[PDB]
Design a binder for this molecule. Structure first.
Ligand SMILES: OC[C@H]1O[C@@H](O[C@@H]2[C@@H](CO)O[C@](O)(CO)[C@H]2O)[C@H](O)[C@@H](O)[C@H]1O
Ligand SMILES: OC[C@H]1O[C@@H](O[C@@H]2[C@@H](CO)O[C@](O)(CO)[C@H]2O)[C@H](O)[C@@H](O)[C@H]1O
Ligand SMILES: OC[C@H]1O[C@@H](O[C@@H]2[C@@H](CO)O[C@](O)(CO)[C@H]2O)[C@H](O)[C@@H](O)[C@H]1O
Ligand code: NA
Lengths: 989, 989
């Protein structure tokens, strides 16, 4: 007998390999004077759990709809209480059997009534700029068609279906479809109509598409202009006017403009233009720039550029894939404020409004097609859509719509086929189509390392070492001599590098030095701009970001989606502050004698005339001198030495020895720009006169012995433990050696290579570093000075079930006012476990104080955190912060907040102040212990316990980027060693 | 200056390598007529966290004691609210730096006042039978000495210190000491005075020690008797009387008793004897037996024996290491009731009272010395006390006290040097001392595989395969020809095997067959007798067992201490019921034609005269015939064929075909024994006439089609899912294929060997077997019979992110009364993941019923659970249990309760009854889902949800012993395959 199952037809369509049906030809997104009506607003919405249960109750007619409630459109509907967001990284959340879909498939029925006036007749269309993942569209009950390609635009002719007056638009949206198999980006799965819905009139004698060709001849200064215009796919008579250039020309003819000012990210010159036919006029912004690959270099307007980039997803912590325009504008301004000049639209085209902002503010853009089949990799790429002939039309269509929509924007300097889609016939077809359609932009795609169908060689997270070999052109050959010759002639880009998850990223400086040294290196794009945190509100009302698994997912990838330089609300992480410094476009090297500074202009086109150069000398008491210096403009890629005013050097020469003083030279905007105000800091450099080494106090005070306690000046010691119980009145609950920290996200990633691929966090756990214990060996007093004495406490630190340890000796000294503490660490037995060497996170001390800290001040680096392979943006100076603001609000709490390179510190314990001095140490102050920090999965898990946890580290490990990419570089690793270091302590009430 | 730390002297003593000081010579535990006073009772107790804080406040004088509270003695003090028990398996809970102790070291001060009458003067002693781990003893403020060796006895002379009238006994007990390094058994760390404290008078002209030598000459039947007696270490004139043997002899002379009845575990003949001098008489029980190794066989009284053994720890779920005598007696009786004949005192000497019970009830005992340095293995045995000359005196002393205390007991047939202590000089010294002192008992020690200093070759958890090679004497040679020749001449024992943790142990039968086949194989001792569960009581008042980590331990090993054949309260696990059958001492093979049975006497000394042989024929209606048969006694190791009464065969011949009937033949005690009552079952065998295969119902009923539902007889199907929603009125919430079960403890252990060492539980998790999903492919009806039709539902089962799946087709048939269900499974793509083949736990169905089940009945195997490599004790029959009693109360909930080999089943869902028939299937019924079972860490985590979860399995995996030892044997593994199987269903209201 026949079939008896329900919904076979809906499901047959969802499983289709075809692109959408019924849509108009793909075209550019154009600003037109044609009437248009946004249908955005409050729609009606009904959710069904699958296609077999989705009602076929004539709901498209909008009459007697039961089960519908209001929903804003555009929206990601799980951000509004309908289902829940779900995060997977690589793994598909459904069985991998393309093109088939699971039974649990949220079906969202959307409906809106609207009014169409006579200006939309006789011809109009409906435009949808994004539907995830499969839409079926009805107007007044007549099926317009379907949509495939979730971040791509679709237009439907409504001529003869749209009626004057009231109309009813209905859209059935399936979360999962065959397209889901090619939309496996590392991000939240979020169904919805998440971009604009527009009704546009199409008057007769209008303009459907426009293709701007605006080249630049850097030898003559000429612009090369051709503006194509078409209607129904045929070239049409149109007039092109560019008033600023005194130009009137016909569409379709190439002309040479005698002297144009060229467009670049540094100088994003745009000329306002209009293309007009009888019934319609289109407004354009034209930036003249030519892109070329020459001598294995990526060049714009005749010059090799340096990409200073980020990977930009579209995410909002409360609206999902809907990013309000005001947030877009602000975040692009924030990027420019941190010296970013390039953006990759990972991994799909952005909102169409994005490109004009990129044109205007100035970014080199890698516009990527909506294609990613990452989940097929684990099966050896079996059934990969990228190589399956049945998917060719679907994938070419994705590329076509990507290219057509954005082809007029100067800011787009590369087209990208997709991301992590393997290699295959359909990728080659997408490349062939793009090269024929638009030869003016090189093609990018990292998935095929042979680079057979691209114009640049692209890699993700290649090590600093391999990048140096590539920059010199000495990487190993491809097996195919012809392909090897082609790839060696290509410039090289890191489409993703220095993974910015949690504490980090480390190793940015070593990449950047290579970028500057080797012309073949185009630069790199950080993974990634933002964390995809989703706001969650508790009963108390306290908000925190959630991540994978916080929404009930059966399969998920945890906090791997919170991996950005800013949080979901665009608050910078420390890594962004470091990144801005690393990529700063000018290098300022201040002379040790304070007589001047060397200034290198790292820009590619602009000189230094936009910048005001300012100097300031700061000391303990505050600013001693400051001013501005006149710098004759320095050409791009040129260098000069600038004399500073004689007062600065003279000031340096007059400082008594050991008095600390910091000279800072800054390059700030002389005037407001489109992205920041005058005085915004772009680059800086410093020369420091360091404070003298701290003088051990004279051991003049003796030790008082008592039954259970010992006193030495202001320090009171427990006689049973040997550690101090109070010092200057401030209670000390515990003092001991530390070798471990609460693992970062990087420490949770695998150290690939060698026989040991355990994450460092696991190595540490296996080794017992998280659970150290101390045995007291002895306490003795020894002859000091003029009757005084030192107190030596000998301990051994180890962990249960381990034979290795470190002997630790504390030697205390005091003159009644200052406390001298020498600490001496010595290995006892080999620190090897499970057959591998144990590494340390740190060599330091943990003071646990029985009172709360309100304020932390220090002299060293700041204001933000710094670790051995980070902190580039932390500058030398004097800093003071409330305790709450020493912490870093990572979504998963982890080690953070250390201030490396500190020379002195003051903790304000209410009425008293504790001072620490010493040779350079790292400083951390927290109101909770390391075990609470490690145990915490979200920030509300952190609770202050009334104490102060003070960490003084003589040595620190780097943080690296091991969550994805290289671990800590050799020079920053911390292997077990012997070590001795001195501190002074003082309590000033 | 001098030291300033506190408690250095106490700690210096705890770190001492010496044995105890001040104690009398080690001697036997003897029953004497000398006056004795137990000091057991309510003592006063004070706990301090370490030696540096333990008061030196003159507390030993018992006057003005502050901070003391009542505590029972004997006790493990963490079982009474003072600190907490802590469980570690191998790892030490302190840093490994012998002989040093951690700062956190519970110090327990014990004190008791008592009255000593004139019968304890002039000479008396104080006896301590166990202190964990280091005791210091004062009497009336005078230091008697110290104790080392936590499960060993110490006696102190109190002559001249004990006063007539009131006395004050004070004992300072440290949990940790240098001895802790040699007491690293896999068990709870439990400090305390955990065995008897006795005041014993020592009258003049008494007897301090006695050494019984009672040999047996199996050729002549003669006993060989010599009883040594000494005082102050010198041989003394004593008289030895043995009334039953008409003997009066002098101590110290060897005599030949003409005809003794020899002692064995099977026939534990004991002769009452008394050794007496003028001032003291000692009562003895003498069992005559000679032990010998001959022709690579372990022999007793001239014959090779088979050890049917368990490893017996001393544990009580509420008293710790204190085992009440009534529990000891009951558990030994329970052992005999399950055919056990041998006990290893893992891994220390037991309570001294244990040995006379072993003598009397009849066990071959391996008495092990208190020595285990397991925690040194992870460092390559660096610093192992067993090879460190500084520990020689400590370790010889442990062996000396072990041997001296128990040397008079016939039940001790082997001395063991210790457990998991590596190899070393001190072990060799312990062996040398023992061989010189007592050559009558072979020496055992598994730690040194070369067997250089032992008389038997011992291994733990050697595979069934390696055991078969050893039994044939073809294992590989040692590199030292001399040592190889010695070891090849040795018999072989598995001191630990078939690890009994959780569901299991599997593979017992394959070991046992080898034991019977190969004389060199002595048998084996199961690890272990009991689970060390500790009772925990919640606010509700519900008790459950806790394990490692349930008491706040920083380092622990979880539920690896709950790994026994009985729970902590001695309730049998299914593995014990299986074990009893596996080791049954008689083999009964019932003839297929029911005319008789073959009977092999597997005993070593006894014939079959103790046994009554009974038969019974059972059918659906109940017993059809039964009686007793007279078996002329069968000699040990002999065989005969016993005719059954003609009525039984005649009954068999008269059964209509397909009618099920079970013939059972049982060997029960003819009369009460010391360990069970008459009628206790010892062995059994069965012959079954199986029920006919179930007849598919005639497909005479058609399918009614409806908008959303389908009806076929009494089955109602959801049209959207294809699965039934009710059947006979009972609601069905879900039906689907299962391939996975909630991992057992064995499934959580590593499959050593191959490139894949992930535990099967992890293999499953990585593969998605725990999270299967089903896609509906189609539903169609097809021509049945006389207008009826079948309904076929086609599905595919897979998991998210996986390409492999199984196609499943359900074909339904009904004649209105019975429902026929054919299920057909077919692999689609290779079930490979992470580069390794995925194995299945099962091929079955899960019915989730929307109503509760009160009663489960079946015909198959029972009453207890059975899996492919277990269930030996489950016999064929008809069974019925309430739902609660289908479950197995393992401490960590896990897969359990399957009844393999079922042919029919009836679930009573209140007023209705669901019947299932089919070819052999496994049956499981639960009131909670598999995910709740897996998630649960303790039994209170299980919660009934109102449903019934019914599992019908066409195939099951074995359970093995992978938690420690071999995994599932090849023949019981379940690799992916195609499969088809049929069921019938019927609801009788
Ligand atoms: O956050 C990781 C980002 O990097 C890439 O994904 C990573 C791949 C690259 O082959 O390596 C892993 O670490 C393996 O799991 C991936 O996470 C993606 O291109 C980015 O979209 C993003 O996921
Ligand atoms: O419950 C395990 C029992 O077996 C032995 O310990 C195991 C050793 C044998 O070398 O192998 C391990 O599985 C490794 O961890 C141990 O658990 C002990 O002899 C027994 O006392 C007991 O622990
Ligand atoms: O503690 C005295 C013991 O005497 C033992 O036997 C004598 C010892 C004394 O050196 O040496 C022997 O040869 C035994 O090895 C005997 O002559 C007793 O057997 C012990 O029980 C005990 O009495
Ligand atoms: Na165990």
């Amino acid at each position: 007998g026949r079939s008896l199952e329900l919904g076979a037809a809906d499901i047959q369509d969802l499983e289709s390999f075809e692109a959408g049906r019924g849509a108009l030809p793909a075209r550019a997104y154009l600003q037109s004077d044609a009437p248009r009506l946004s249908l955005n607003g409050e729609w009606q919405f009904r959710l069904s759990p699958g296609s077999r249960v989705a009602p076929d109750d004539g709901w498209q007619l909008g009459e007697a709809l039961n089960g519908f409630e209001s929903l804003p459109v555009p929206s990601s509907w799980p951000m509004h209480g309908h289902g829940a967001p779900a995060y997977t990284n690589v793994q598909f959340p459904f069985a991998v059997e393309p093109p088939h879909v699971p039974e649990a498939n949220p079906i969202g029925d959307h409906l809106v009534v609207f009014e169409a006036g006579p200006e939309f007749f006789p011809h109009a269309l409906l435009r949808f700029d994004g539907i995830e993942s499969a839409g079926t569209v009805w107007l007044n009950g007549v099926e317009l068609g379907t949509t495939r390609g979730s971040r791509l635009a679709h237009e439907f002719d409504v001529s003869g279906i749209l009626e004057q007056g009231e109309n009813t638009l209905a859209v059935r949206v399936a979360q999962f479809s065959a397209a889901s198999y090619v939309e496996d980006q590392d991000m939240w799965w979020l169904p919805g109509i998440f971009r604009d819905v527009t009704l546009q009139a199409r008057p007769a004698a209008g303009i459907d598409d426009v293709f701007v060709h605006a080249g630049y001849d850097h030898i003559t200064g000429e612009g090369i202009l051709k503006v194509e215009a078409s209607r129904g796919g045929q070239a049409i008579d149109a007039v092109v006017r560019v008033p600023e250039l005194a130009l009137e020309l016909a569409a379709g003819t190439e002309v040479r403009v005698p002297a144009v000012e060229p467009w670049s990210a540094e100088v994003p010159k745009l000329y306002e233009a209009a293309v007009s036919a009888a019934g319609e006029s289109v407004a354009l912004q034209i930036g003249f720039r030519s892109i070329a690959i020459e001598d294995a270099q990526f060049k714009v307007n005749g010059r090799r550029i340096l990409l200073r980039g980020v990977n930009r997803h579209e995410h909002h912590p409360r609206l999902g894939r809907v990013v309000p325009r005001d947030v877009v504008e602000a975040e692009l301004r924030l990027m420019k404020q941190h010296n970013i000049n390039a953006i990759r639209t990972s991994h799909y085209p952005p909102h169409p409004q994005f490109l004009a902002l990129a044109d205007q503010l100035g970014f080199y853009v890698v516009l990527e097609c909506d294609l990613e089949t990452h989940g097929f990799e684990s099966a050896g790429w079996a059934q990969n859509p990228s190589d399956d002939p049945q998917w060719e039309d679907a994938l070419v269509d994705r590329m076509r719509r990507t290219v057509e929509r954005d082809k007029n924007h100067a800011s787009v300097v590369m087209w990208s086929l997709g991301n992590e889609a393997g290699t295959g016939r359909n990728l080659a077809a997408m490349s062939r189509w793009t090269k024929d359609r638009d030869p003016s932009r090189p093609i990018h795609y990292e998935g095929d390392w042979s680079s057979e169908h691209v114009d640049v060689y692209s890699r993700m997270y290649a090590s600093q070492a391999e990048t140096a070999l590539i920059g010199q052109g000495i990487e190993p050959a491809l097996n195919d001599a012809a392909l090897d010759a082609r790839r060696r002639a290509m410039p090289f880009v890191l489409c993703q590098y220095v993974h910015a998850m949690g504490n980090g990223p480390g190793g940015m400086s070593e990449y950047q030095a290579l970028f500057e040294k080797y012309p073949r290196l185009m630069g790199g794009f950080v993974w990634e701009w933002l964390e995809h945190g989703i706001t969650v509100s508790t009963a108390d009302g306290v908000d925190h970001y959630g991540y994978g698994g916080d929404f009930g997912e059966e399969v998920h990838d945890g906090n791997f989606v919170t991996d950005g330089l800013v949080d979901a609300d665009r608050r910078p992480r420390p890594g962004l502050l470091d990144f801005k410094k690393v990529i700063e476009p000018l290098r300022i090297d201040v002379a040790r004698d304070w007589t001047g500074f060397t200034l290198r202009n790292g820009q590619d086109f602009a000189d230094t005339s936009a910048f005001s150069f300012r100097y300031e000398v700061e000391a303990d008491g505050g600013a001693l001198d400051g001013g501005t210096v006149d710098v004759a403009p320095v050409a791009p890629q040129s260098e000069t030495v600038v004399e500073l005013p004689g007062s600065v050097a003279a000031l340096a020469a007059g400082l008594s020895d050991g008095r600390p003083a910091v000279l800072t030279v800054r390059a700030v905007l002389g005037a407001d720009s489109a992205w920041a105000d005058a005085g915004h800091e772009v680059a800086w450099g410093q020369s420091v006169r360091e404070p003298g080494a701290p003088v051990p106090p004279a051991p003049v005070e003796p030790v008082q012995v008592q039954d259970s306690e010992l006193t030495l000046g202001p320090v009171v010691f427990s006689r049973a433990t040997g550690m101090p119980t109070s010092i200057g009145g401030v209670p000390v609950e515990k003092l001991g050696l530390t070798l471990w920290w609460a693992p970062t996200d990087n420490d949770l990633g695998r150290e690939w290579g060698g026989a040991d691929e355990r994450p460092l966090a696991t190595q540490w756990k296996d080794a017992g570093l998280n659970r150290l214990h101390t045995r007291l060996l002895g306490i003795s007093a020894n002859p000091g000075q003029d009757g005084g004495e030192t107190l030596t406490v000998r301990t051994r630190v180890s962990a249960a079930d381990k034979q290795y340890g470190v002997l630790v000796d504390y030697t205390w000294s005091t003159d009644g006012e200052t406390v001298g503490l020498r600490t001496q660490v010595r290995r006892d037995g080999t620190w090897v476990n499970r057959g591998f060497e144990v590494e340390w996170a740190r060599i330091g001390l943990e003071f646990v104080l029985g009172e709360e800290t309100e304020l932390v001040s220090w002299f060293g680096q700041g204001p933000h955190q710094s670790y051995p392979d980070t902190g580039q943006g932390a500058r030398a100076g004097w800093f003071s912060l409330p305790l709450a603001k020493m912490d870093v609000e990572y979504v998963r709490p982890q080690e953070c907040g250390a201030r490396s390179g500190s020379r002195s510190a003051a903790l304000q314990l209410g009425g008293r102040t504790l001072e620490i001095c010493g040779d350079p140490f790292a400083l951390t102050v927290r109101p909770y212990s390391q075990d609470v920090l490690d145990a915490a999965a979200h920030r509300p898990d952190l609770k202050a316990d009334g104490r102060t946890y003070l960490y003084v580290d003589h040595a620190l490990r780097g943080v690296g980027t091991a969550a994805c990419g290289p671990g800590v570089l050799e020079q920053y690793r911390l292997k077990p060693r012997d070590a001795d270091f001195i501190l002074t302590l003082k309590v000033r009430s």
